[PDB]
Amino acid sequence: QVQSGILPEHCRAAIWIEANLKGDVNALREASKIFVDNVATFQAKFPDAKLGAVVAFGNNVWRQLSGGEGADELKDFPVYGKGLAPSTQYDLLIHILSARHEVNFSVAQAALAAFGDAIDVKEEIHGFRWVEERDLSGFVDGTENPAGEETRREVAVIKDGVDAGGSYVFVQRWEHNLKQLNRMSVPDQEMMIGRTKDANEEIDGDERPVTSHLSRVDLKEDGKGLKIVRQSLPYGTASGTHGLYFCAYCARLYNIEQQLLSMFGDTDGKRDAMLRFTKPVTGGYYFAPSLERIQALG
Amino acid sequence: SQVQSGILPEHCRAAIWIEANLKGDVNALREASKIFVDNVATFQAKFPDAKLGAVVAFGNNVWRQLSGGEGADELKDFPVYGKGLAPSTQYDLLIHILSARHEVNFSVAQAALAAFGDAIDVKEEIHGFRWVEERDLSGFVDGTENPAGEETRREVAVIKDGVDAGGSYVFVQRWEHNLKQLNRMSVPDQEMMIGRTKDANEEIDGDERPVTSHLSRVDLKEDGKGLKIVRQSLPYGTASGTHGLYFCAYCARLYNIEQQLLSMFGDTDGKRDAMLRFTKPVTGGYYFAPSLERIQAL
Ligand code: HEM
Ligand code: HEM
Ligand SMILES: [Mg+2]
Ligand SMILES: [Mg+2]
């Protein structure tokens, strides 16, 4: 029932396509069915790829396609920090991930064929897992991410109601200034992230700055962590633009927003220390329906 | 005389090519090249399962200065062929990294950039990927008649004796495929354009294909002896944006490559390669890849 791209762990490669609707919103109905059917066919042709994909929709298009039912939390991505985190809300998100980039590429071509000239691609980003699953900063990325299908479902997949089997998705492309990073001592970098670099051990929350990344995003409400399922990957070229393509799924948009309010100064006036070397340049919220809901579009 | 490690490996899944001009004193390339090949050895030691190789190669002007004009008798700036049908974008430095792991290639690319630093101006960085069934993005298998096995590939690509023993000539040319234009062609028309059948990759007899077919352009014999080259080309690009083939070939004789270019681009018999109906080259350069010992003697 859940779209196949939310739950797989440890993908080696991904493709994200962000697009605006140029034509009739009804063109997205048949296109989405064709695409998720294509994904199933590719899974059968390439069983070792552990392929999955997600089609997700921006607020205005999803309100139209759903007749206003459900997706109670969905909204256009606002700026956070009054503009520190920009807003680039689009109509359509396609997320493809697997162990084999060459399979992802074929699936992306299938997606473009399905939607045709109804969509205007705003960016297409090819993510790759780097050495030791580290972000390009050199810090391991993923350690506290929900692990195993059971917990990942609990965090990311809506349990009941009209949206059962769906998920909220957030995507935000960051551009790393690695020269600025390399000007910082390793201890300074470690206090910026909140974990040690080589060994990847958490620095005690009582002993690290409240601006450290972990202090910004490891949030609890009455002892209950506001968890999300991250699917982020490095992207780019060594000599040109490079960074992290951040992607997160959650059964509640709330959990993602609270982390963004924290990181970008809205909650307590303090900003994530990572902004000293990297910055976000896109941002969008999308709703990923269940597969049954996609099939019911037309 | 040891060959650089990136010339001979077969069926690499991923590559990075960096093309750059010299910004500073050519003498800066001496230590930088020695650092780079040492870095390559380090990454081979750290990631034995990547089966990494790399090549540093030099354009005519730079190499004439670094070598004092000795050897590399065939090296020259890449000319335009076909009066401009093949454009010329001769740069000073080529770095070619290939392996089983794109993420290791990326680290090696970063090492190259750190070693050469501001002595170079990067003109393009291209990330190649092997596609399904080793097909070019046109859908045709690419590599079938490439020299196979270390012994034959050495014979074709690696200079055997003299001052340049262990070295090789390199040609790189980036192509931009118009897949929409390709898909307007019937499969039989496409097969007459290439000279092999599409699905089964059977060679079409030379008396059964047009003289403009790719194979008729490049499968050249002189007194019965084929003018062989070692191709390392890979697909590159995004599904929605620029995509094509990054063509790369190694040969102990630049002559073999040039004869094929004169054929493809109309200079030999007034006919040109049928592939120009859907794809076009947008860069072109010749480089000399010295032996590893010669790099140590820089
Ligand atoms: C440049 C952008 C980012 C980079 C390089 C980055 C990197 C990291 C690293 C190195 C960790 C520690 C290891 C781990 O547990 O995964 C981490 C953790 C985490 N990140 Fe980020 N991150 C970025 C952006 C974001 C954003 C935008 C959000 C949320 C809106 C976020 C949410 C989280 C969460 C929830 C954790 C787990 C914290 C914990 O419970 O310990 N990250 N990230
Ligand atoms: C868009 C650019 C190109 C594409 C898509 C392409 C594709 C192909 C394909 C599909 C084959 C047949 C399978 C094989 O034997 O590998 C082939 C063969 C070959 N290509 Fe190309 N190629 C391109 C450019 C070039 C260039 C620029 C050269 C030479 C300068 C070249 C030289 C060769 C050679 C020598 C062969 C082997 C021919 C034989 O002996 O049968 N190719 N190529
Ligand atoms: Mg924690
Ligand atoms: Mg032949």
Numbering used by the authors:
A (entry chain B): 3 to 300
B (entry chain A): 2 to 299
What do the authors of the reporting publication say about this deposited model?
The enzyme investigated in this work originates from the human pathogen Klebsiella pneumoniae and belongs to class B. All structures exhibit a dimeric ferredoxin-like fold typical for dye-decolorizing peroxidases, composed of antiparallel β-sheets with four β-strands connected by α-helices. In all DyPs, the prosthetic group (i.e. heme b) is coordinated by a proximal histidine (His-215), which is hydrogen-bonded with a fully conserved aspartate (Asp-268). The fully conserved distal aspartate is responsible for deprotonation of H2O2, whereas arginine 232 is important for maintaining the distal heme cavity architecture and might support heterolysis of the O–O bond by transiently and electrostatically interacting with the negatively charged distal oxygen atom.
The WT structure was solved by molecular replacement using the DyP structure from V. cholerae (VcDyP). At the distal heme side, a pronounced hydrogen-bonding network is observed, including the proposed catalytic residues Asp-143 and Arg-232, water molecules (W1, W3, W4, and W5), and propionate p6. Importantly, a salt bridge between Arg-232 and propionate p7 stabilizes the distal architecture. The distal access channel to the active-site pocket composed of Asp-143, Arg-232, Phe-248, Leu-246, and Ser-234 is narrow with a calculated bottle neck radius of 1.2 Å (calculated by CAVER). The second access from the surface is via the solvent-exposed propionate p6. One narrow channel leads perpendicularly to the distal heme pocket, and its small bottleneck radius of 1.2 Å suggests that it only allows access of H2O2 or small ligands like cyanide. The second access channel is relatively open and leads to the solvent-exposed propionate p6. The negative standard reduction potential E°′ of the Fe(III)/Fe(II) couple of −350 mV clearly suggests a pronounced imidazolate character of His-215 in KpDyP. We have demonstrated that the distal hydrogen-bonding network including Asp-143, Arg-232, and several water molecules (W1–W5) as well as the propionate side chains p6 and p7 of WT KpDyP is stable between pH 4.5 and pH 10.0, as is reflected by almost identical HS spectra determined by both UV-visible and EPR spectroscopy. In the case of WT KpDyP, the extraordinary stability of Compound I strictly correlates with very poor peroxidase activities.
